[PDB]
Design a protein around this nucleic acid. Structure first.
Ligand SMILES: [Mg+2]
Ligand SMILES: [Mg+2]
Ligand SMILES: [Mg+2]
Ligand SMILES: [Mg+2]
Ligand SMILES: [Mg+2]
Ligand SMILES: [Mg+2]
Ligand SMILES: [Mg+2]
Lengths: 136, 104, 55, 84, 175
RNA sequence: CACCCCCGUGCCCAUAGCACUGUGGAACCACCCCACCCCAUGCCGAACUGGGUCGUGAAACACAGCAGCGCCAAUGAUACUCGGACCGCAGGGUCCCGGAAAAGUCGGUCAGCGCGGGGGUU
RNA sequence: AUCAACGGAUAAAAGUUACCCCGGGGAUAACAGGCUGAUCUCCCCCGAGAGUCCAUAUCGGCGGGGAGGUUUGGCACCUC
RNA sequence: UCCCAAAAUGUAACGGAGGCGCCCAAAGGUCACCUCAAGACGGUUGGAAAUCGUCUGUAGAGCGCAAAGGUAGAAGGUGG
RNA sequence: UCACAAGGCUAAAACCUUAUGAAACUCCGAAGGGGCACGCGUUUAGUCCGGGAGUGAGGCUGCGAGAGCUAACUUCCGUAGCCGAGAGGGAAACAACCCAGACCAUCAGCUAAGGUCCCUAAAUGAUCGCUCAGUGGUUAAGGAUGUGUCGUCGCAUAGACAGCCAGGAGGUUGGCUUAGAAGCAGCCACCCUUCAAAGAGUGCGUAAUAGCUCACUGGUCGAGUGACGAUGCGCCGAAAAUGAUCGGGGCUCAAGUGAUCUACCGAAGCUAUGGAUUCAACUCGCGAAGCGAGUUGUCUG
């Protein structure tokens, strides 16, 4: 969810995924195919969805984190200063990045659990597995 | 500490001066009192005490300063600047200078 | 090295207009025989896309 | 006069005219005095025949030709190698 | 494994079923143009722990091991392969797949088997005498049971490149 | 640069650095020794500084081994990008043409070139 | 010399006008339109859970994608 | 002062942050000398840091105030 | 430095393995850019002094950012180009986009961007393909045995997928959980017997039962058939107010669309011929500069 302390406000720009493997931690994973701003509540939706589906275990790895402040329209204005810090927190996610990875659950127990999570996401995704050895 | 030699050495602003450097290794009872030209990595004069001192070790103080002042004067070395190690400029070392200052 | 101005200088960046001026080409169709020196070959590479190069 | 602050928190108009940088580069015929660098600390330290002003500014002592010495990075020097 | 050309102009292979690769040791650093389909079909079998005889254009058979693969992001398809030219008697440090065997008297109780390190770095095994897998018994484990480096069997004359107390397989609780 | 070695000083600031193992002593160098005064410790001769041997090379220094750590670091492919030319409502993306990283990997190193003085080749 | 409104109009200076007057401005607000669509209105996706039992007869948490241009606005483009 | 500022300089906004309107006869000149923050182990007030001791220790300290640059061969810290 | 993901570890700070984010982080670090010297070259401006100014509302687009909703025909910078002050062709129409900078004349010629069924200049062009929705000629999540081409996993003439005959498990109304929970509200497992075979079993039915089927098993049959993914073109999703439409007619019997190839059209661009102007060097009429004439070059929104 939100971060503990920081600077307050930010900016915005885009280009292809930097630090996001495929394996590590889990067996199966979920990968972004489009660039986006993944809201805090958007992840918190996916966690809850996958969490419920597995019942007991909690073997879900949330690789993405909302390390980004977004501002908003108090009511109308423009005549006046910079805008409200407290709209939402976001994680900039570029194609290739692993957002979520699952452990111990079966192939299908994961195909479906991720399918449900996809429906709570603002972008196209795909499920992944093994053969990713860069560093371990 | 060791910072003392590099402090005294760096403050002896090398080729800006034009003048020659006068080293002293007063750490032992065997000097080196070398005359080093800043520019070329070359030593011009130099007067030690290792081979013959006449018995003296901290007493040879002026002798080796007087020896060098004479040794330099042959080559025509007139303009020079002294550089101590961590040496406080007082006894064995102050003599070598006061003997060169008076010895030409 | 035969060079001819085939595209217009209008809407093209300053430097490219200035190069096409140095190369002595004033109209479209304008052709000239050129030096095999690195700077004169260098001018011809700057405005390559505006010229038709024979050899 | 109310109990609220004399100075209102959260501003941003604040900034300053500001200058700086290198004035003479590697391979330039300088006259004596000609400033070679404007700097904050000692990005470039004074070399052979180059003086350092109060504000770490580097000026020429004698006419010549500017040579830059980049000792591995962290220790940098500007010196003059006269044409005469 | 077979291949053709090796220049720095790759437009002749770009669209085609080819992957540009390299092989090095300390003598010959030969560039490649191998088949994507063949490399994929075979690399998936052998991984880093295994090696294969690579014959260039004509006939120059060479034994080589896979060092690193730099795949394209977006589309998980590989784009560049790095081969290491194998000597005869001594190899490098190889990351070995840590697999599991049997059920745990903890997994059935409430928890599950969690392999912390999926691949393990091992010192001087010997080439063509490299372990293709790494079977580890888990049955003895309950809840709070960890297995470090100094708990794994190494097949004949092998040593661990990783720290003695580095957690490999730990059985975790529910929820 | 006769060949070695030691003490000074330098260009060169890690491909020169550290740790760990070793060789070195009566030539040099260190500790050591005493110190009332020159002169000195916001307290103490630890340090500076003065007067000298032995003793011991312990510690420090000097040299030599070694790749465990540091440090250097390719080739290939890539990110990015000048210029040229395009897609998509947009976020964004592509093709040609040259320039081309960073990280990583192969692998490289327990430095190299001086000036002066000292001591040995019984 | 908080000449600090800091290139500093005089040594020396606050308000009000619905009683208002002139010169101008679509360089600039209020109405309408235009562009936009946050908000507004509708619609779709997923399916937790409610429906004694059964996700989908009805209902649809958390979250996601659109359409419209009737709201409040933004913006200030013709019209002072 | 920093960021915006597109690796020369410069560059706007009722863009993001923060400080100044001083202080010091030593906090200046010069000449000498000194070397930091922190951790681990061990020690009377104490017991979280602390006055001491020994190992590690390019700086993780300091620089009268904001920050950036810089800086231990000192710009840091002591004295004549 | 600040933020941060799984684990180790210890009394959490530190520390270690794996893993990341950064305008105000940086051990690194381009492409570019800037200064200077040289001109190996090719060009044609610049500087200084003095007279006269006007202009100090800019606008769009691309690219790089902030503000703003990664809204605006929005705002404020950077940078290039055009309009401003720019005619001509194209883009139906259309400051800005694309092509191209108009000295004058011609009932001549070649080309650019764009085009070549008829309106309307020029191939109803050639070849191998795609789509059948008028897509072309209104957007998305999401959805789908739509056709085209390449890949991955299997099952097979020792006879599979589908289809009909026929069997359907004994234990056991598995334990728990309950007012009952029996293959089918939820917690733990998915052990066994007979064999040609039947899984503490998928969906419906009852209040719990039963019913009626599947996962599995033979005969009859005979030849390929079932699932994940990639991609090309298409489908659904797809509702706004005066009367409709891609400019229109009309087009699949391509006039749509992917790739290659030529031939023609097409401008005030280039060219041909004639003439005029500007500056220049070169000739000359004159007592001299200079003004006239006269070539050649160049210029002329
Ligand atoms: Mg490195
Ligand atoms: Mg280019
Ligand atoms: Mg470009
Ligand atoms: Mg566009
Ligand atoms: Mg390229
Ligand atoms: Mg209005
Ligand atoms: Mg999209």
């Amino acid at each position: 969810k939100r971060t503990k302390f920081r600077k307050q406000f930010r900016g915005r720009m885009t280009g292809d995924a930097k630090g996001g493997d495929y394996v590590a931690f889990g067996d199966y994973g979920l990968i972004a195919m489009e660039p986006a701003w993944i809201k805090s509540n958007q992840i918190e939706a996916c966690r809850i969805v996958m969490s419920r589906h597995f019942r007991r275990g909690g073997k879900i790895y949330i690789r993405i984190f909302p390390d980004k402040p977004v501002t908003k329209k108090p009511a109308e204005t423009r005549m006046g200063k910079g805008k409200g810090a407290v709209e939402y927190w976001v994680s900039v996610v570029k194609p290739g990045r692993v957002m979520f990875e699952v452990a111990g659950v079966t192939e299908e127990q994961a195909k479906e659990a991720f399918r449900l999570a996809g429906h709570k996401l603002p972008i196209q995704t795909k499920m992944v597995k093994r053969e990713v050895y860069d560093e371990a | 500490r060791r910072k003392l030699r590099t402090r005294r050495k760096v403050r002896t602003t090398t080729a800006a001066s034009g003048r020659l450097r006068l080293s002293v290794y007063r750490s032992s009872k065997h000097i080196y009192a070398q005359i080093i030209d800043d520019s070329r990595g070359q030593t011009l004069a130099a007067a030690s005490s290792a081979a013959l001192k006449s018995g003296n070790k901290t007493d040879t103080a002026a002798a080796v300063g007087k020896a060098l002042a004479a040794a330099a004067a042959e080559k025509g070395i007139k303009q020079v600047v002294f550089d101590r190690g961590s040496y406080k400029y007082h006894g064995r070392v102050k003599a070598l200078a006061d003997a060169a200052r008076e010895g030409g | 090295m035969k060079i001819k101005l085939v595209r217009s200088v209008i809407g093209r960046p300053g430097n490219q207009v200035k190069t096409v001026q140095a190369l002595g080409l004033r109209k479209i169709g304008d052709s000239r025989e050129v030096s095999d020196t690195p700077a004169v070959r260098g001018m011809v590479k700057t405005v390559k896309h505006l010229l038709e190069v024979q050899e | 006069a109310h109990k609220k602050g004399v100075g209102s928190s959260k501003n941003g108009r604040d900034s300053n005219p500001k200058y700086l940088g290198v004035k003479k580069f590697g391979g330039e015929v300088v006259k004596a005095g000609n400033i070679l660098v404007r700097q904050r600390g000692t990005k470039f330290k004074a070399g052979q025949g180059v003086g350092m002003g109060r504000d770490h500014t580097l000026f020429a002592l004698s006419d010549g030709k500017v040579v830059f010495i980049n000792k591995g990075k962290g220790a940098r020097f500007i010196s003059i190698e006269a044409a005469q | 494994m077979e291949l053709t050309a090796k220049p720095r102009t790759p437009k002749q292979k770009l669209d085609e079923s080819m992957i540009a690769a390299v092989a090095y040791n300390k003598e010959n650093n030969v560039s490649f143009a191998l088949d994507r389909k063949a490399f994929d079909r075979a690399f998936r079998q052998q991984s880093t722990t295994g090696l294969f005889d690579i014959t260039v254009e004509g006939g120059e058979t060479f034994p080589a091991l896979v060092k690193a693969v730099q795949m394209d992001k977006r589309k998980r398809a590989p784009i560049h392969v790095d081969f290491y030219m194998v000597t005869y008697g001594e190899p490098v440090e190889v990351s070995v797949p840590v697999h599991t065997t049997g059920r745990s008297q903890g997994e059935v109780q409430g928890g599950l088997v969690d392999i912390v390190v999926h691949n393990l770095q091992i010192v001087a095994p010997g080439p063509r005498r490299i372990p293709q897998e790494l079977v580890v018994d888990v049955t003895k484990m309950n809840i709070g049971d960890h297995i470090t480096a100094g708990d794994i069997k190494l097949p004949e004359g092998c040593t661990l490149a990783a720290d003695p107390e580095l957690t490999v397989v730990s059985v975790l609780p529910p929820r």
